[PDB]
Amino acid sequence: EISPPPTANLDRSNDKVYENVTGLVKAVIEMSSKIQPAPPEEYVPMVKEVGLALRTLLATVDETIPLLPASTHREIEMAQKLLNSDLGELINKMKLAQQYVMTSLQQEYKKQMLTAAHALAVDAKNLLDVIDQARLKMLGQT
Amino acid sequence: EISPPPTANLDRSNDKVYENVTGLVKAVIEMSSKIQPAPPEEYVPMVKEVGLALRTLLATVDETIPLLPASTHREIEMAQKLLNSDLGELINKMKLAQQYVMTSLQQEYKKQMLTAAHALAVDAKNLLDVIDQARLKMLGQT
Ligand SMILES: [Cl-]
Ligand SMILES: [Cl-]
Fold this sequence. Notes:
The structure is a homodimer. By secondary structure, chain A is mostly helical. Chain A has 4 helices and no strands. The longest helix of chain A has 33 residues. Chain A starts with 15 loop residues before the first helix and ends with a helix. At the A-B interface, helix 1, helix 2 and helix 4 of A face helix 1, helix 2 and helix 4 of B. The complex binds chloride ion (2 copies). One chloride ion (CL) binds next to loops of chain A. One chloride ion binds next to loops of chain B. Chains A, B: Belongs to the protein kinase superfamily. Tyr protein kinase family. FAK subfamily. Chains A, B: It is found in: Cell junction, Focal adhesion; Cell membrane; Cytoplasm, Perinuclear region; Cytoplasm, Cell cortex. Chains A, B: This is Focal adhesion kinase 1.
């Protein structure tokens, strides 16, 4: 049920009860979000968090490419494109999942959306590894 | 697919790429845990996080009760018992949800498990408020 925000007449800087209530409410909220299948309308905002994380990573990689050997650029740049490829797929299977909300396809497109997301994480790790090999190659310094 | 942990020959203290890959992988993992319905076997560990959070809160409240007016104790102590009541319910509907994994009751007991968890969060907030009224009453100091 609904209640007003906690009283403003008490200092919370060292309020352990308040911190612990907070902790417990978050653990419950987190537990229910995992146990329950998120409503198709939550897809968009979840996908937005993943997109922001991706461009923050792509911007950073662009700031790193210049500082690396010319011979590593092509492979790195290709790794980046595979990621945008995974994002397009993700975004598109999301919209499809949302399209057929109450049909025999909702679950299948949802699965394909999850597979796209999974690929995006696998390919991010492979990018890190391609970047590390480039960095280590650069250290070819005596 | 499976790959070795990232190279140990590079310092990560200021590695923004590594931090960003990490961020993106977490956002993906978090997204999939929300979109997907967690397997009944994940219930236990999730419920353990909620239980630890509860006793940490109950221990803290026990350390606070003594410092409050004798007239507020009974109501506070009752608030605590309502929480252990919610935990028993939660634990029991979990086990039931796990019992009837592949029957016509799995989903219903799962729902009852979620209702218990929800009550636990609502009652934690009410406890905070009962504790705040006690604190403010204590300040009856001139
Ligand atoms: Cl507050
Ligand atoms: Cl590492």
